[PDB]
Amino acid sequence: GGSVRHIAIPAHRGLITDRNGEPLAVSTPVTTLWANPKELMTAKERWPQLAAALGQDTKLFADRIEQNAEREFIYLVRGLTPEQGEGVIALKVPGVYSIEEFRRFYPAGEVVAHAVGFTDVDDRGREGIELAFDEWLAGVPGKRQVLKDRRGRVIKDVQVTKNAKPGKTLALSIDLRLQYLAHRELRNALLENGAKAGSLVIMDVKTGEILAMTNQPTYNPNNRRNLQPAAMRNRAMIDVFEPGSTVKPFSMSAALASGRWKPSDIVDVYPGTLQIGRYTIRDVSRNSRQLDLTGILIKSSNVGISKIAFDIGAESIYSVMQQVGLGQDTGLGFPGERVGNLPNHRKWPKAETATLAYGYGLSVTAIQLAHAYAALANDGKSVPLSMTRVDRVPDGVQVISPEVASTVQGMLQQVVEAQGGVFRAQVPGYHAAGKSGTARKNAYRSLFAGFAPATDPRIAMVVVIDEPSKAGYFGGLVSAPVFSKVMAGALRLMNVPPDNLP
Structure with missing residues (x-):
C-alpha cells in the first residue's frame, strides 16, 4: 500500500554519422515489456494468451512465472516495436507493464560494422566507435520515482529526481x-x-x-545471431x-x-x-x-x-x-x-x-x-x-x-x-x-x-x-x-x- 523506489530514466544515445551527416548509428524508440509475477499470480487463467502473445510455450511460461512468484520484477521480452508492445498491452493482463527505452539501428549494416561497432542489450557500447566514444555517446541517465504496492502494483508517480541528459552526436571521419x-x-x-x-x-x-x-x-x-569472432x-x-x-x-x-x-x-x-x-x-x-x-x-x-x-x-x-x-x-x-x-x-x-x-x-x-x-x-x-x-x-x-x-x-x-x-x-x-x-x-x-x-x-x-x-x-x-x-x-x-x- 505504499513504497517509493527510484527508477532510472534512459538517456537518448548520441547519433553517429559519417563525415557528411549520413546516419550510421541511430537510437530507435523500443518498447520493453516487464511483468510483476505477484499480480500475474492473481490472473492465472490469462497466462496462455499472454504466453502465445510472447511467442512462448504455454507450460514453459507457466513454469517461469511460478518459479519467480516471490519476486517483483522479471523481463518478458526486451526491445520491441512500439506496435508490438501495445499489442500485448491491449490484452489488459494484470501485472504486465511496458518500459520505453532505446535500441541502436545501423542503417549501413555490414558495410561499416567494424568501424562503428555495436551496443549490447543495455545500450552500452561494446565494440568500435560505440565503445571508443561511449562516454560521449551515452549521456547521463535520469532519476524518477514511482509508488509501488506491497503487492507490486504501480500506483502513481512521486517525482522526478534528475532529468536524463541525452548523448552527444558524433561525426566520424568516414565518408x-x-x-x-x-x-x-x-x-x-x-x-x-x-x-x-x-x-x-x-x-x-x-x-x-x-x-x-x-x-x-x-x-x-x-x-546478432551466432556471429563467429572471425567475422567480428x-x-x-x-x-x-x-x-x-x-x-x-x-x-x-x-x-x-x-x-x-x-x-x-x-x-x-x-x-x-x-x-x-x-x-x-x-x-x-x-x-x-x-x-x-x-x-x-x-x-x-x-x-x-x-x-x-x-x-x-x-x-x-x-x-x-x-x-x-x-x-x-x-x-x-x-x-x-x-x-x-x-x-x-x-x-x-x-x-x-x-x-x-x-x-x-x-x-x-x-x-x-x-x-x-x-x-x-x-x-x-x-x-x-x-x-x-x-x-x-x-x-x-x-x-x-x-x-x-x-x-x-x-x-x-x-x-x-x-x-x-x-x-x-x-x-x-x-x-x-x-x-x-x-x-x-x-x-x-x-x-x-x-x-x-x-x-x-x-x-x-x-x-x-x-x-x-x-x-x-x-x-x-x-x-x-x-x-x-x-x-x-x-x-x-x-x-x-x-x-x-x-
Missing part, C-alpha cells in the same frame, strides 16, 4: 560513399582470388582522417604482419637524407643473394646485376636495399620508421588494437640492419602502414590519425624533409608506371604512386600501399589480401587491382582533378 565502394571492391577481390580475409584503409594525407576502413569477412550489427575481427587495426617491401620507401628516405645517395646511384645485386655470416639475403627474382635506386624498388631487391642500409646505418632507417608511426601507438583508442613491433638495438648487427631495411622482423598493422604512406604523401609531414571528422587540422611533424619526400614520391610513381612495374595499380586519368609487398604468415598476405595523385597527393591507401588461393600470392597481382579501382572512386568522389589526361 560513407567511399566506405560502400571499398567494402564492395574488397569483397569482389576476395572472391576473385579466393582469399580468406582482407583489409582496406583510405586516408586523407593532409588531415589524418580515416576516410574508409573495411574488413572482410564482416557482419550485420543488426542481426577488426583486421585493419588488430592484424599485425611483416610489411616486407612496402617499407623500402622509408629505407630509401633515410638513404636520400644521409647525403650519400642519389636516385641515379647504382647498386650491384648479382647474383641475387648476399651472405651475412650464416644468414643469406635472398631476392625473389635474381636476374639483375646493377640497379639504380628506383630499380631496387621495382625489383623489390632485398640485396640492394641491404647494401644501402649497410652504408647509411640502421639507426637512420629506424628513426624514419619510428617517426612515421610504424610499430607505434596510433592513439585511436579502439578495442583490441595492436601496436606491432619496431625493434631497436643499441648496436645494430649486420643481419638485423638488413632485415629491417626490407621489412622483415618488424610487424605493423594496415592502419600504421597507411599512416606512414600518408606522411610520405603529405610532403613528409605526419598528421595524427583520426576516426572523427577533423575541422581544425592539427599541426603535423615534419619527419621527412619535403625535398626527400618529393623525390620518393617520384620514385614510387615510377614503380607504378615504369616498365616491369606494378601497372595494375595505375588509376586511369591520374598519376598513382605506390609499392607492392608480400607478408608470409605457403600462406601469404598480398600488400599494396600507395597514394594519389603522385604529383600532388591527397589520398593514401593500403590493401591487405589474406591468403589468396587462385592466382599468384604476389602483391601487385592481387592487391594492386583493388587499389586502382578504389582509388579511382575516391579521387572522383572528392573532385580531385585528373593529372594524367592527354
Whole structure:
C-alpha cells in the first residue's frame, strides 16, 4: 500500500554519422515489456494468451512465472516495436507493464560494422566507435520515482529526481560513399582470388582522417545471431604482419637524407643473394646485376636495399620508421588494437640492419602502414590519425624533409608506371604512386600501399589480401587491382582533378 523506489530514466544515445551527416548509428524508440509475477499470480487463467502473445510455450511460461512468484520484477521480452508492445498491452493482463527505452539501428549494416561497432542489450557500447566514444555517446541517465504496492502494483508517480541528459552526436571521419565502394571492391577481390580475409584503409594525407576502413569477412550489427569472432575481427587495426617491401620507401628516405645517395646511384645485386655470416639475403627474382635506386624498388631487391642500409646505418632507417608511426601507438583508442613491433638495438648487427631495411622482423598493422604512406604523401609531414571528422587540422611533424619526400614520391610513381612495374595499380586519368609487398604468415598476405595523385597527393591507401588461393600470392597481382579501382572512386568522389589526361 505504499513504497517509493527510484527508477532510472534512459538517456537518448548520441547519433553517429559519417563525415557528411549520413546516419550510421541511430537510437530507435523500443518498447520493453516487464511483468510483476505477484499480480500475474492473481490472473492465472490469462497466462496462455499472454504466453502465445510472447511467442512462448504455454507450460514453459507457466513454469517461469511460478518459479519467480516471490519476486517483483522479471523481463518478458526486451526491445520491441512500439506496435508490438501495445499489442500485448491491449490484452489488459494484470501485472504486465511496458518500459520505453532505446535500441541502436545501423542503417549501413555490414558495410561499416567494424568501424562503428555495436551496443549490447543495455545500450552500452561494446565494440568500435560505440565503445571508443561511449562516454560521449551515452549521456547521463535520469532519476524518477514511482509508488509501488506491497503487492507490486504501480500506483502513481512521486517525482522526478534528475532529468536524463541525452548523448552527444558524433561525426566520424568516414565518408560513407567511399566506405560502400571499398567494402564492395574488397569483397569482389576476395572472391576473385579466393582469399580468406582482407583489409582496406583510405586516408586523407593532409588531415589524418580515416576516410574508409573495411574488413572482410564482416557482419550485420543488426542481426546478432551466432556471429563467429572471425567475422567480428577488426583486421585493419588488430592484424599485425611483416610489411616486407612496402617499407623500402622509408629505407630509401633515410638513404636520400644521409647525403650519400642519389636516385641515379647504382647498386650491384648479382647474383641475387648476399651472405651475412650464416644468414643469406635472398631476392625473389635474381636476374639483375646493377640497379639504380628506383630499380631496387621495382625489383623489390632485398640485396640492394641491404647494401644501402649497410652504408647509411640502421639507426637512420629506424628513426624514419619510428617517426612515421610504424610499430607505434596510433592513439585511436579502439578495442583490441595492436601496436606491432619496431625493434631497436643499441648496436645494430649486420643481419638485423638488413632485415629491417626490407621489412622483415618488424610487424605493423594496415592502419600504421597507411599512416606512414600518408606522411610520405603529405610532403613528409605526419598528421595524427583520426576516426572523427577533423575541422581544425592539427599541426603535423615534419619527419621527412619535403625535398626527400618529393623525390620518393617520384620514385614510387615510377614503380607504378615504369616498365616491369606494378601497372595494375595505375588509376586511369591520374598519376598513382605506390609499392607492392608480400607478408608470409605457403600462406601469404598480398600488400599494396600507395597514394594519389603522385604529383600532388591527397589520398593514401593500403590493401591487405589474406591468403589468396587462385592466382599468384604476389602483391601487385592481387592487391594492386583493388587499389586502382578504389582509388579511382575516391579521387572522383572528392573532385580531385585528373593529372594524367592527354
